[PDB]
Amino acid sequence: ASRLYTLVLVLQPQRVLLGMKKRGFGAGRWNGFGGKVQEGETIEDGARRELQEESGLTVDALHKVGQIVFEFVGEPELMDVHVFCTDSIQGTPVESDEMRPCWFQLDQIPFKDMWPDDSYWFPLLLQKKKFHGYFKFQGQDTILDYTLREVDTV
Ligand SMILES: C[C@]12Cc3c[nH]nc3C[C@@H]1CC[C@@H]1[C@@H]2CC[C@@]2(C)[C@H]1CC[C@]2(C)O
């Protein structure tokens, strides 16, 4: 009862690209670029596709940095999110109907307007750590329970 997703962070030496979700689910929060993995696609190829489709960037190399399971109490399906990083991109971000991209300096990451779990694992991603996490939510705002650990192998 777990569904595969990817989440990709475009991370350069002193800045990160985030996209504000403009409409629909999770609207009003900044996030990386993510989506469902397709039948017949590897997780990595899904991550590349989601990044390119949502941001307009071309990614040349991607690195897996974490895996986070999300549970919403009462909802049967878990989200098994595979998190990736890249700093080897081409092109410029494209604003769309769905997504407004902005670059952020690392000291100005907008955690108050992100999913609350990000406050826990983003610092690990920024420090080039790898991790395994689990977050149990009640609705979209409240973390009931979590675990997070650093790993050498995702
Ligand atoms: C993985 C997300 C995004 C996120 C960033 N930091 N933390 C999170 C957790 C959050 C958990 C819910 C996910 C949501 C992604 C969009 C999902 C899968 C949504 C469920 C349905 C939808 C819109 O497809």
Side-chain angles (χ1 to χ4, degrees), residues 5 7 25-26 30-32 36 70 72 79 81 115-118 121 137:
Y5 298 79
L7 182 59
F25 180 86
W30 296 101
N31 189 21
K36 287 163 194 198
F70 296 90
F72 293 82
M79 291 164 226
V81 179
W115 281 79
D117 51 293
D118 294 7
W121 59 264
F137 277 78

mmCIF file of all heavy atoms in Angstrom, residues 5 7 25-26 30-32 36 70 72 79 81 115-118 121 137, ligand 1:
data_model
loop_
_atom_site.group_PDB
_atom_site.id
_atom_site.type_symbol
_atom_site.label_atom_id
_atom_site.label_comp_id
_atom_site.label_asym_id
_atom_site.label_seq_id
_atom_site.Cartn_x
_atom_site.Cartn_y
_atom_site.Cartn_z
ATOM 1 N N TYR A 5 6.859 7.955 -5.585
ATOM 2 C CA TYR A 5 6.994 9.336 -6.033
ATOM 3 C C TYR A 5 8.474 9.706 -6.052
ATOM 4 O O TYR A 5 9.324 9.067 -5.402
ATOM 5 C CB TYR A 5 6.312 10.308 -5.084
ATOM 6 C CG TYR A 5 4.817 10.089 -4.958
ATOM 7 C CD1 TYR A 5 4.315 9.067 -4.163
ATOM 8 C CD2 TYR A 5 3.916 10.841 -5.694
ATOM 9 C CE1 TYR A 5 2.956 8.867 -4.033
ATOM 10 C CE2 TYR A 5 2.554 10.612 -5.613
ATOM 11 C CZ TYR A 5 2.078 9.580 -4.825
ATOM 12 O OH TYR A 5 0.737 9.392 -4.665
ATOM 13 N N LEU A 7 11.030 13.377 -5.879
ATOM 14 C CA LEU A 7 11.130 14.775 -5.494
ATOM 15 C C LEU A 7 12.569 15.195 -5.796
ATOM 16 O O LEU A 7 13.488 14.565 -5.280
ATOM 17 C CB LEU A 7 10.763 14.950 -4.030
ATOM 18 C CG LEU A 7 10.779 16.375 -3.507
ATOM 19 C CD1 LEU A 7 9.825 17.213 -4.295
ATOM 20 C CD2 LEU A 7 10.403 16.425 -2.062
ATOM 21 N N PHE A 25 -3.595 20.785 -5.562
ATOM 22 C CA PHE A 25 -3.121 20.262 -4.293
ATOM 23 C C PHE A 25 -1.837 20.929 -3.806
ATOM 24 O O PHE A 25 -0.955 21.263 -4.620
ATOM 25 C CB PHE A 25 -2.852 18.778 -4.513
ATOM 26 C CG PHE A 25 -2.357 18.185 -3.209
ATOM 27 C CD1 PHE A 25 -3.256 17.726 -2.258
ATOM 28 C CD2 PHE A 25 -1.001 18.205 -2.894
ATOM 29 C CE1 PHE A 25 -2.810 17.208 -1.061
ATOM 30 C CE2 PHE A 25 -0.561 17.696 -1.680
ATOM 31 C CZ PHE A 25 -1.469 17.183 -0.778
ATOM 32 N N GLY A 26 -1.755 21.144 -2.466
ATOM 33 C CA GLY A 26 -0.572 21.699 -1.819
ATOM 34 C C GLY A 26 -0.213 23.088 -2.342
ATOM 35 O O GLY A 26 0.917 23.598 -2.144
ATOM 36 N N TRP A 30 6.118 26.286 -1.290
ATOM 37 C CA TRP A 30 7.312 26.059 -2.093
ATOM 38 C C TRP A 30 7.731 24.614 -1.951
ATOM 39 O O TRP A 30 7.598 24.056 -0.856
ATOM 40 C CB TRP A 30 8.448 26.941 -1.575
ATOM 41 C CG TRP A 30 8.199 28.408 -1.714
ATOM 42 C CD1 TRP A 30 7.802 29.255 -0.718
ATOM 43 C CD2 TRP A 30 8.343 29.203 -2.895
ATOM 44 N NE1 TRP A 30 7.650 30.516 -1.193
ATOM 45 C CE2 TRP A 30 7.972 30.518 -2.520
ATOM 46 C CE3 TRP A 30 8.766 28.958 -4.202
ATOM 47 C CZ2 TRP A 30 7.988 31.535 -3.451
ATOM 48 C CZ3 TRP A 30 8.793 29.982 -5.124
ATOM 49 C CH2 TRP A 30 8.360 31.240 -4.728
ATOM 50 N N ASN A 31 8.283 24.052 -3.006
ATOM 51 C CA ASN A 31 8.723 22.672 -3.000
ATOM 52 C C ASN A 31 9.704 22.438 -4.130
ATOM 53 O O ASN A 31 9.815 23.232 -5.048
ATOM 54 C CB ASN A 31 7.508 21.767 -3.157
ATOM 55 C CG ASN A 31 7.712 20.277 -2.973
ATOM 56 O OD1 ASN A 31 8.686 19.830 -2.356
ATOM 57 N ND2 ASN A 31 6.760 19.502 -3.509
ATOM 58 N N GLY A 32 10.387 21.305 -4.060
ATOM 59 C CA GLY A 32 11.086 20.750 -5.197
ATOM 60 C C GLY A 32 10.092 20.226 -6.236
ATOM 61 O O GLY A 32 8.890 20.473 -6.158
ATOM 62 N N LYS A 36 4.543 11.335 -9.632
ATOM 63 C CA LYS A 36 4.369 9.891 -9.634
ATOM 64 C C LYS A 36 5.298 9.241 -10.646
ATOM 65 O O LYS A 36 5.569 9.796 -11.689
ATOM 66 C CB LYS A 36 2.905 9.566 -9.969
ATOM 67 C CG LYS A 36 1.949 9.863 -8.842
ATOM 68 C CD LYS A 36 0.464 9.945 -9.212
ATOM 69 C CE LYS A 36 -0.293 10.585 -8.080
ATOM 70 N NZ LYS A 36 -1.733 10.337 -8.132
ATOM 71 N N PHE A 70 5.658 8.938 3.668
ATOM 72 C CA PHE A 70 4.623 9.776 4.256
ATOM 73 C C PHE A 70 3.344 8.984 4.448
ATOM 74 O O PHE A 70 2.886 8.299 3.562
ATOM 75 C CB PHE A 70 4.312 10.995 3.394
ATOM 76 C CG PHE A 70 5.474 11.938 3.256
ATOM 77 C CD1 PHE A 70 6.398 11.811 2.230
ATOM 78 C CD2 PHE A 70 5.652 12.933 4.186
ATOM 79 C CE1 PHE A 70 7.467 12.684 2.119
ATOM 80 C CE2 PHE A 70 6.729 13.793 4.086
ATOM 81 C CZ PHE A 70 7.652 13.672 3.049
ATOM 82 N N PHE A 72 -0.638 9.659 5.872
ATOM 83 C CA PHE A 72 -1.698 10.541 6.311
ATOM 84 C C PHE A 72 -2.721 9.689 7.061
ATOM 85 O O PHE A 72 -3.230 8.714 6.522
ATOM 86 C CB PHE A 72 -2.343 11.258 5.138
ATOM 87 C CG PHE A 72 -1.358 12.207 4.504
ATOM 88 C CD1 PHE A 72 -0.405 11.744 3.577
ATOM 89 C CD2 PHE A 72 -1.307 13.512 4.955
ATOM 90 C CE1 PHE A 72 0.528 12.618 3.050
ATOM 91 C CE2 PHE A 72 -0.389 14.380 4.406
ATOM 92 C CZ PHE A 72 0.542 13.923 3.485
ATOM 93 N N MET A 79 2.940 7.313 0.768
ATOM 94 C CA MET A 79 3.746 7.871 -0.304
ATOM 95 C C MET A 79 5.207 7.555 -0.046
ATOM 96 O O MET A 79 5.779 8.029 0.927
ATOM 97 C CB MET A 79 3.615 9.391 -0.371
ATOM 98 C CG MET A 79 2.266 9.822 -0.819
ATOM 99 S SD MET A 79 1.920 11.550 -0.487
ATOM 100 C CE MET A 79 0.272 11.317 0.180
ATOM 101 N N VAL A 81 8.541 8.408 -1.170
ATOM 102 C CA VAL A 81 9.153 9.498 -1.920
ATOM 103 C C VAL A 81 10.663 9.317 -1.992
ATOM 104 O O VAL A 81 11.342 9.305 -0.970
ATOM 105 C CB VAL A 81 8.781 10.867 -1.314
ATOM 106 C CG1 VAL A 81 9.434 11.983 -2.088
ATOM 107 C CG2 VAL A 81 7.283 11.049 -1.231
ATOM 108 N N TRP A 115 6.239 22.480 3.208
ATOM 109 C CA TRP A 115 5.779 21.356 4.009
ATOM 110 C C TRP A 115 6.597 21.353 5.287
ATOM 111 O O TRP A 115 7.814 21.492 5.233
ATOM 112 C CB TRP A 115 5.892 20.052 3.196
ATOM 113 C CG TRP A 115 4.767 19.882 2.222
ATOM 114 C CD1 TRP A 115 4.576 20.452 0.997
ATOM 115 C CD2 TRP A 115 3.560 19.159 2.496
ATOM 116 N NE1 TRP A 115 3.338 20.132 0.513
ATOM 117 C CE2 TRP A 115 2.696 19.316 1.391
ATOM 118 C CE3 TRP A 115 3.138 18.365 3.559
ATOM 119 C CZ2 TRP A 115 1.437 18.719 1.333
ATOM 120 C CZ3 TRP A 115 1.897 17.769 3.488
ATOM 121 C CH2 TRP A 115 1.066 17.943 2.391
ATOM 122 N N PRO A 116 5.974 21.024 6.445
ATOM 123 C CA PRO A 116 6.670 21.139 7.715
ATOM 124 C C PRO A 116 7.804 20.133 7.887
ATOM 125 O O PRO A 116 8.784 20.427 8.586
ATOM 126 C CB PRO A 116 5.600 20.963 8.752
ATOM 127 C CG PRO A 116 4.497 20.279 8.073
ATOM 128 C CD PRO A 116 4.544 20.777 6.605
ATOM 129 N N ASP A 117 7.708 18.991 7.219
ATOM 130 C CA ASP A 117 8.791 17.999 7.291
ATOM 131 C C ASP A 117 10.107 18.542 6.728
ATOM 132 O O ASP A 117 11.203 18.107 7.086
ATOM 133 C CB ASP A 117 8.416 16.713 6.570
ATOM 134 C CG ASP A 117 7.912 16.932 5.155
ATOM 135 O OD1 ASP A 117 6.835 17.511 5.042
ATOM 136 O OD2 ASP A 117 8.597 16.534 4.226
ATOM 137 N N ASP A 118 10.012 19.483 5.786
ATOM 138 C CA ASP A 118 11.216 19.955 5.103
ATOM 139 C C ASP A 118 12.221 20.561 6.083
ATOM 140 O O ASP A 118 13.427 20.494 5.840
ATOM 141 C CB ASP A 118 10.909 20.963 3.999
ATOM 142 C CG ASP A 118 10.139 20.424 2.811
ATOM 143 O OD1 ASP A 118 9.698 19.268 2.886
ATOM 144 O OD2 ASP A 118 9.899 21.218 1.855
ATOM 145 N N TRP A 121 14.532 17.537 7.118
ATOM 146 C CA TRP A 121 15.436 16.851 6.206
ATOM 147 C C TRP A 121 16.182 17.770 5.229
ATOM 148 O O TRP A 121 17.232 17.404 4.730
ATOM 149 C CB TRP A 121 14.737 15.727 5.436
ATOM 150 C CG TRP A 121 13.568 16.138 4.591
ATOM 151 C CD1 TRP A 121 12.245 16.100 4.939
ATOM 152 C CD2 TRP A 121 13.581 16.608 3.236
ATOM 153 N NE1 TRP A 121 11.463 16.504 3.901
ATOM 154 C CE2 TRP A 121 12.253 16.812 2.853
ATOM 155 C CE3 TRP A 121 14.591 16.806 2.311
ATOM 156 C CZ2 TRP A 121 11.911 17.236 1.573
ATOM 157 C CZ3 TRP A 121 14.267 17.225 1.050
ATOM 158 C CH2 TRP A 121 12.943 17.433 0.692
ATOM 159 N N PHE A 137 1.415 12.345 9.204
ATOM 160 C CA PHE A 137 0.661 13.582 9.221
ATOM 161 C C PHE A 137 -0.786 13.379 9.610
ATOM 162 O O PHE A 137 -1.381 12.348 9.271
ATOM 163 C CB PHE A 137 0.649 14.193 7.821
ATOM 164 C CG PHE A 137 1.877 15.018 7.478
ATOM 165 C CD1 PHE A 137 3.101 14.469 7.118
ATOM 166 C CD2 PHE A 137 1.758 16.407 7.522
ATOM 167 C CE1 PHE A 137 4.182 15.276 6.802
ATOM 168 C CE2 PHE A 137 2.839 17.200 7.149
ATOM 169 C CZ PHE A 137 4.068 16.628 6.848
HETATM 170 C C1 LIG B 1 5.436 14.531 -1.075
HETATM 171 C C2 LIG B 1 4.508 15.753 -0.722
HETATM 172 C C3 LIG B 1 5.411 16.969 -1.035
HETATM 173 C C4 LIG B 1 6.315 17.286 0.042
HETATM 174 C C5 LIG B 1 7.418 18.070 0.108
HETATM 175 N N1 LIG B 1 7.953 18.033 1.318
HETATM 176 N N2 LIG B 1 7.223 17.228 1.989
HETATM 177 C C6 LIG B 1 6.204 16.749 1.260
HETATM 178 C C7 LIG B 1 5.191 15.851 1.630
HETATM 179 C C8 LIG B 1 4.075 15.840 0.691
HETATM 180 C C9 LIG B 1 3.101 14.634 1.098
HETATM 181 C C10 LIG B 1 1.824 14.643 0.259
HETATM 182 C C11 LIG B 1 2.188 14.527 -1.203
HETATM 183 C C12 LIG B 1 3.109 15.664 -1.559
HETATM 184 C C13 LIG B 1 3.462 15.499 -2.972
HETATM 185 C C14 LIG B 1 2.222 15.535 -3.891
HETATM 186 C C15 LIG B 1 1.206 14.412 -3.577
HETATM 187 C C16 LIG B 1 1.912 13.082 -3.839
HETATM 188 C C17 LIG B 1 0.867 14.577 -2.078
HETATM 189 C C18 LIG B 1 -0.178 13.497 -1.903
HETATM 190 C C19 LIG B 1 -1.023 13.635 -3.228
HETATM 191 C C20 LIG B 1 -0.163 14.372 -4.263
HETATM 192 C C21 LIG B 1 -0.684 15.755 -4.526
HETATM 193 O O1 LIG B 1 -0.130 13.724 -5.481
#
